[PDB]
Design an enzyme around this catalytic site. Structure first.
Site, mmCIF file in Angstrom:
data_model
loop_
_atom_site.group_PDB
_atom_site.id
_atom_site.type_symbol
_atom_site.label_atom_id
_atom_site.label_comp_id
_atom_site.label_asym_id
_atom_site.label_seq_id
_atom_site.Cartn_x
_atom_site.Cartn_y
_atom_site.Cartn_z
ATOM 1 N N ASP B 92 2.344 -102.259 -7.661
ATOM 2 C CA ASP B 92 2.390 -100.803 -7.522
ATOM 3 C C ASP B 92 2.707 -100.220 -8.889
ATOM 4 O OD1 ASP B 92 5.198 -100.917 -7.827
ATOM 5 O OD2 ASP B 92 5.519 -101.080 -5.676
ATOM 6 N N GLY B 94 4.976 -97.864 -9.670
ATOM 7 C CA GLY B 94 6.381 -97.647 -9.852
ATOM 8 C C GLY B 94 6.908 -96.277 -9.512
ATOM 9 N N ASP B 266 -0.190 -102.732 2.700
ATOM 10 C CA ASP B 266 1.060 -103.413 2.369
ATOM 11 C C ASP B 266 2.184 -102.702 3.115
ATOM 12 O OD1 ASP B 266 1.028 -101.185 0.123
ATOM 13 O OD2 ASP B 266 3.096 -101.844 0.414
ATOM 14 N N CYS B 304 1.307 -117.162 19.343
ATOM 15 C CA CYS B 304 1.373 -117.287 17.892
ATOM 16 C C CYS B 304 1.219 -118.728 17.433
ATOM 17 C CB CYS B 304 2.710 -116.708 17.398
ATOM 18 S SG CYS B 304 2.918 -116.827 15.598
ATOM 19 N N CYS B 306 2.114 -119.814 14.498
ATOM 20 C CA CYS B 306 2.905 -120.144 13.317
ATOM 21 C C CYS B 306 3.844 -121.319 13.560
ATOM 22 C CB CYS B 306 3.668 -118.907 12.823
ATOM 23 S SG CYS B 306 5.295 -118.629 13.564
ATOM 24 N N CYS B 309 6.941 -120.629 15.789
ATOM 25 C CA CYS B 309 6.709 -120.683 17.225
ATOM 26 C C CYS B 309 6.317 -122.062 17.712
ATOM 27 C CB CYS B 309 5.619 -119.665 17.590
ATOM 28 S SG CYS B 309 6.208 -117.971 17.315
ATOM 29 N N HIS B 335 7.538 -115.943 10.852
ATOM 30 C CA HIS B 335 6.823 -115.527 12.053
ATOM 31 C C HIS B 335 6.156 -114.174 11.854
ATOM 32 C CE1 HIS B 335 5.675 -114.416 16.020
ATOM 33 N NE2 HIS B 335 6.352 -113.284 15.839
HETATM 34 C C1 LIG Z 1 3.054 -96.386 -6.351
HETATM 35 N N1 LIG Z 1 2.318 -95.225 -5.868
HETATM 36 C C2 LIG Z 1 2.450 -94.885 -4.560
HETATM 37 N N2 LIG Z 1 3.203 -95.561 -3.668
HETATM 38 C C3 LIG Z 1 3.343 -95.198 -2.378
HETATM 39 C C4 LIG Z 1 4.149 -95.940 -1.504
HETATM 40 C C5 LIG Z 1 4.219 -95.494 -0.178
HETATM 41 N N3 LIG Z 1 4.912 -96.007 0.869
HETATM 42 C C6 LIG Z 1 4.629 -95.190 1.911
HETATM 43 N N4 LIG Z 1 5.123 -95.350 3.158
HETATM 44 C C7 LIG Z 1 6.032 -96.440 3.472
HETATM 45 N N5 LIG Z 1 3.790 -94.192 1.563
HETATM 46 C C8 LIG Z 1 3.519 -94.383 0.256
HETATM 47 C C9 LIG Z 1 2.705 -93.625 -0.596
HETATM 48 C C10 LIG Z 1 2.634 -94.072 -1.925
HETATM 49 C C11 LIG Z 1 1.882 -93.395 -2.880
HETATM 50 O O1 LIG Z 1 1.161 -92.285 -2.553
HETATM 51 N N6 LIG Z 1 1.777 -93.789 -4.167
HETATM 52 ZN ZN LIG Z 2 5.123 -117.249 15.362
#
Ligand SMILES: CNc1nc2cc3nc(NC)[nH]c3cc2c(=O)[nH]1
Ligand SMILES: [Zn+2]
Ligand SMILES: CNc1nc2cc3nc(NC)[nH]c3cc2c(=O)[nH]1
Ligand SMILES: [Zn+2]
EC number: 2.4.2.29
Lengths: 368, 368
Positions: B92, B94, B266, B304, B306, B309, B335
């Site tokens: 990401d 940051g 993610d 599952c 895994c 399990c 898990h």
């Molecule tokens: C690193 N840039 C970036 N990270 C994010 C992490 C996020 N995590 C969530 N929900 C858990 N929404 C998000 C949006 C962004 C986003 O618009 N930009």
């Molecule tokens: Zn499992």
């Protein structure tokens, strides 16, 4: 396999190397038993424990009887099934941890205590809890005499322990399934006093056990004094049965103990201190949190064959421990248990080859 | 393999399934990326992460740049070498974690902040830190607009993000080694406003990226609203590049997102909530700490595949979590990541076989 067979394959001085055959597997001696406190060797899957070379683990009766409960574990199929370790398990008898970890009331019957809610242990209940857990090696219910102790107090305590040893024997024998499938070890007490150690040895031998522990050591007396007591105490025990030193210890403690006749060991030091950032190496322990490892690309130990040293650097494990990451505990623990198993393997091999005395000396010059 | 190649093998509605080929490996899409916060997927060895079916993991730039440091990781050989994951890593950029986890000062240049000591991030530094870490998929440095946002604020924020997107592109391209070996994804912003999403999509397409994220969601708007925004937003993105929804999400979030065109995800939910005692099952999540599992010999989930399990019961994992044992975190995490990978596999297969719509419906009826 038989219920229990101890064979000595090779001797050097007082040191011995051999095997314990039991129904759930073979135990190579001298053996190190990783400790499973509450039905887990902390931070390791049982397959990982096995991969390090462990043949047997220890379970703590005190913790298990409190959480999740012996009867519950029995209902669920026994400790082996519950935690996923199918090889031998030695269970302690619980008194040591009661006295160090729990309010308590001691009597000739046993001990009542409050969980750290009201609980009881006695020779009979101890032996029954170990049965419910499905232990392979059952420890007699004893009193670990505090250190220091006056001769009078040491004697009183030892005598009670020997009465409890007889009670333990009879409880074990009264339970057919237990007596047919498990082994029972007696524990010698007597503090640091040779005559009390002798009386204890005699009492235990007359009762008769599958193995004999040297109890009451590693309780603050220091290595010099522990070795002095082992010097006269281990020869008092039957030669043809295993000799177990519980709660020991550092690598040098183990080497010195084997030189004096001990065949079995358990200790939390590799697991607990591993989580604390202490790594064992052939050049002595290191504290991986120290700044000097932050960019050290070498493995924890230069020779270690474990998976941790094959794959990760000191610098990474330093970071993990610094960061309080679970994988840091995992990796440190795996290494340290592997290191202990490799130590035991080197001891076994050197005894088998009649070069243990030389190994002990070399080990010590490098480790220190 | 090529630096980057995304191929779509099969389509159903807006859903797609295919592959991303990169130098360090192939990524099956739709993909779930386990999160490696500080150079570890918490409580898992990388081999275990791989065993669950993960093809790629995410690394958090904010945490890494603070501890152990990007330059240090670079000196030690890069994140892959450091943590022992040799497959693709998406980092990401940051900003999201700066704004949610660190004191901060925002400007057109970037953001300065104090570690939770004084640090800076900007398009250029972000891209350089991801380079130093040796990231395979580099995220443009963006501003995740808080929710709710007024249209004016959403527009101002989005416009800055698009300026930063151009700066990110140019910084990435200026670094030959990075541009030749890594990919760069742009991030769409615009809050919940269709015209702003469109302007953002257009800006990002004119710059040109290897992939496009839908940023600014899963920030408190709720699933209904997130789906509504995805409905118009994902078709604005180039069809022939991957579509990434960061920070999502629950299993149903993922299914619904794939139905609307998302290829990559993610989330910390499987790891963090696993350590918290939440286990995902095809019949919905369970909290393993609940007393009703104390004697339940069934695995966490009935189907599952895994290793957890296959080998351990709910009752055991209940005990471990109750006891705060590290192995409980280990097993719950393994898990839950396996469950997420099996979900993604079922999505991929069902799309490939043109039965995804039916899978989504069946999944939902049973899960709820
Ligand atoms: C690193 N840039 C970036 N990270 C994010 C992490 C996020 N995590 C969530 N929900 C858990 N929404 C998000 C949006 C962004 C986003 O618009 N930009
Ligand atoms: Zn499992
Ligand atoms: C369970 N019975 C029992 N446990 C013990 C545990 C010990 N742990 C140490 N040092 C760490 N010494 C010990 C002695 C005994 C002992 O004499 N008896
Ligand atoms: Zn090692």
């Amino acid at each position: 396999r038989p219920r229990f067979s101890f064979s000595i394959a090779a001797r050097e001085g007082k040191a011995r190397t051999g095997t314990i055959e039991m129904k759930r597997g073979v135990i190579r001696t001298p053996a190190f038993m990783p400790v499973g406190t509450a039905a887990t060797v902390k931070a390791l899957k049982p397959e990982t424990v096995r991969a390090t070379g462990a043949d047997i683990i220890l379970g703590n009766t005190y913790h298990l009887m409190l959480r999740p409960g012996a009867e519950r574990i029995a209902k669920l199929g026994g400790l082996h099934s519950f935690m996923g370790w199918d090889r031998p398990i030695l269970t302690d008898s619980g008194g040591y941890q009661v006295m160090s970890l729990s309010l308590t009331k001691q009597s000739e019957e046993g001990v009542t205590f409050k969980s750290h809610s009201r609980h009881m242990l006695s020779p009979e209940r101890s032996i029954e809890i170990q049965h419910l857990l499905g232990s392979d090696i059952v420890m007699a219910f004893d009193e670990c005499t505090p250190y220091p102790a006056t001769p009078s107090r040491a004697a009183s305590s030892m005598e009670r322990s020997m009465r409890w040893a007889k009670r333990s024997r009879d409880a074990f024998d009264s339970r057919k399934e237990q007596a047919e499938n498990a082994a029972l070890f007696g524990i010698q007490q007597g503090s640091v006093f040779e005559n009390l150690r002798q009386q204890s040895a005699d009492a235990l031998a007359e009762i008769g056990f599958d193995g004999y522990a040297v109890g009451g050591l590693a309780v603050g007396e220091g290595q010099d004094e522990m070795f002095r007591v082992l010097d006269f105490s281990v020869p008092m025990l039957p030669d043809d049965k295993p000799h177990y030193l519980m709660g020991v210890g550092k690598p040098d403690d183990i080497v010195g103990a084997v030189e004096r006749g001990i065949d079995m060991f358990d200790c939390v030091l590799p697991t607990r201190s591993g989580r604390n950032g202490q790594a064992f190496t052939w050049d002595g322990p290191i504290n991986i949190r120290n700044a000097r490892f932050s960019e050290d690309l070498k493995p924890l130990d230069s020779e270690c064959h474990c998976a941790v040293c094959q794959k990760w650097s000191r610098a990474y494990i330093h970071h993990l421990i610094r960061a309080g990451e679970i994988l840091g505990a995992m990796l440190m623990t795996e290494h340290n248990i592997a290191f202990y198993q490799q130590l035991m393997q080197k001891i076994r091999d050197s005894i088998s080859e009649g070069r243990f005395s030389q190994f002990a000396q070399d080990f010590r010059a490098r480790y220190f």
